[PDB]
Design a protein around this ligand. Structure first.
Ligand SMILES: N#Cc1cncc(COc2cc(OCc3cccc(-c4ccccc4F)c3Cl)ccc2CNCCO)c1
Lengths: 116, 116
């Protein structure tokens, strides 16, 4: 019965505005590193690769480096919160996340940028 | 480091010819159901959803029903072997898998159909 919910399927943020997107998963009070694996993607681009407490920076995509970080503290709560600072038009698209803690599931999130 | 290899990144099969595609993963002598979760996809279409020894048939896509089955015996060997019988042009495309047994990973496989 391990399913993983998103709050909202569509985020609509302006250019330059900092964004953060969420993926709520079940946690049994406390959290285990050896169990937890998290991943983020947008059109086959490595955004986050988090394996039991190991973000490798080389593996991340070149056009995401000083901007796309996952909030570490948020995972204690039971939420993979991916942050982007200084949003671009280029970042607009469909964002996959994948999570494995006990069970496993994934979800897609549409992201559409604006520009005044 | 739990990584999951494909033998070949491109399968080239004729129309009507039966196809089978592979995803080799590590197994530590014996295999555990409660651990293993497997999934198959092609352009956001549910092909297989296998959760600790549970294929649900309703969840599978409508245009895949009497054709796309995963070989159960093959998983003992350490290989998710997805079979399609009676291949169509419609089935040609990019096939995602993905697997969680101990660790987790995913891989894409290009599939290009022929007809002489
Ligand atoms: N360039 C490039 C490129 C090409 N291929 C793959 C990658 C990313 O490779 C990873 C992804 C990853 O997360 C996937 C994940 C997380 C949580 C649950 C599931 C998960 C599993 C099964 C069912 C449901 C699920 F939700 C999955 Cl599949 C973890 C580790 C790796 C390591 N990759 C290197 C070895 O192959 C990058």
């Amino acid at each position: 019965a391990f399913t993983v919910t998103v709050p909202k399927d569509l985020y609509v943020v302006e250019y330059g505005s900092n964004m953060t997107i969420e993926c709520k998963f079940p946690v049994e009070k406390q959290l285990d590193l050896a169990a937890l694996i998290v991943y983020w993607e947008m059109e086959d681009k490595n955004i986050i690769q988090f394996v039991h407490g190991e973000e490798d920076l080389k593996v991340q995509h070149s056009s995401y480096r000083q901007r796309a970080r996952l909030l570490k503290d948020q995972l204690s709560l039971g939420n993979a919160a991916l942050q982007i600072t200084d949003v671009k038009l280029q970042d607009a698209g469909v964002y996959r996340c994948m999570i494995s803690y006990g069970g496993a599931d994934y979800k897609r999130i549409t992201v559409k940028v604006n520009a005044p």
